[PDB]
Amino acid sequence: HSVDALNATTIDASDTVTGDTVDATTTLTDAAGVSHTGELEDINHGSKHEDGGSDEISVGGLSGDLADPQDPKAHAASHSADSADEISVENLSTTGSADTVPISQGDGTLSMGS
Amino acid sequence: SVGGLSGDLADPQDPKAHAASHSADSADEISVENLSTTGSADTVPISQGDGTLSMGS
Ligand SMILES: [Zn+2]
């Protein structure tokens, strides 16, 4: 059967319902059975999630290490002689000439004495 | 891209260069009396020149 304009209440087909434009006001129910009532995800959308864009995501609790190095906490307090992360003074730098020694000036401050 | 996103990762991250943030004046702090040495009792850090410290007596 062939028409111009089919005006109906309900339409139901046992094979393809093709159209070079499909228009779903009010509801869409997919092949699994989820009944959408708003706009849908285009492929390659991910840019939207990035800083300040619409539908931004939290990184809180996500896993793995980044290819790029990151600003850490202020974390000097994480190092000590007792910890698995270890640094020793014989590894450390100084501007002082040969036979110079680190000595305290008071006022929290170290210096190269002799 | 993760650039400009917010939150704390469950796995720790390889840090940016940050030695300056361990200064006497910075917003976090470490002191020499906290630090290790392999040197025996009464050994003292002494400079050999060439930027480098050593455990002498
Ligand atoms: Zn660090």
Side-chain angles (χ1 to χ4, degrees):
Chain A
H1 175 60
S2 56
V3 283
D4 80 336
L6 197 93
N7 299 163
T9 309
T10 59
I11 299 154
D12 185 1
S14 298
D15 208 330
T16 57
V17 181
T18 303
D20 213 46
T21 295
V22 168
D23 182 355
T25 55
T26 314
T27 285
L28 160 68
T29 305
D30 56 35
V34 175
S35 300
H36 314 278
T37 315
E39 55 175 304
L40 304 169
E41 279 296 2
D42 318 296
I43 60 141
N44 309 340
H45 52 266
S47 179
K48 71 202 288 175
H49 306 306
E50 307 179 357
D51 184 12
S54 53
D55 190 36
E56 183 185 83
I57 67 154
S58 181
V59 173
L62 294 182
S63 303
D65 54 344
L66 288 150
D68 293 323
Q70 302 297 305
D71 288 84
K73 266 78 181 180
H75 73 275
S78 67
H79 307 278
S80 281
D82 291 339
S83 52
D85 269 278
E86 180 180 10
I87 191 74
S88 70
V89 172
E90 58 265 39
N91 308 129
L92 294 176
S93 186
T94 186
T95 60
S97 306
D99 297 344
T100 56
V101 181
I103 69 155
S104 177
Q105 288 287 323
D107 198 15
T109 303
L110 285 162
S111 60
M112 279 293 132
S114 297
Chain B
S1 182
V2 168
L5 295 183
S6 304
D8 52 333
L9 280 156
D11 291 332
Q13 304 296 302
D14 272 303
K16 179 176 163 186
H18 70 273
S21 73
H22 292 199
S23 303
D25 293 332
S26 53
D28 197 25
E29 179 179 8
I30 191 66
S31 70
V32 170
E33 57 266 40
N34 303 124
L35 304 180
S36 176
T37 187
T38 63
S40 305
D42 296 341
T43 56
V44 183
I46 68 162
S47 174
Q48 290 296 332
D50 197 19
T52 304
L53 285 168
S54 67
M55 283 294 145
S57 302

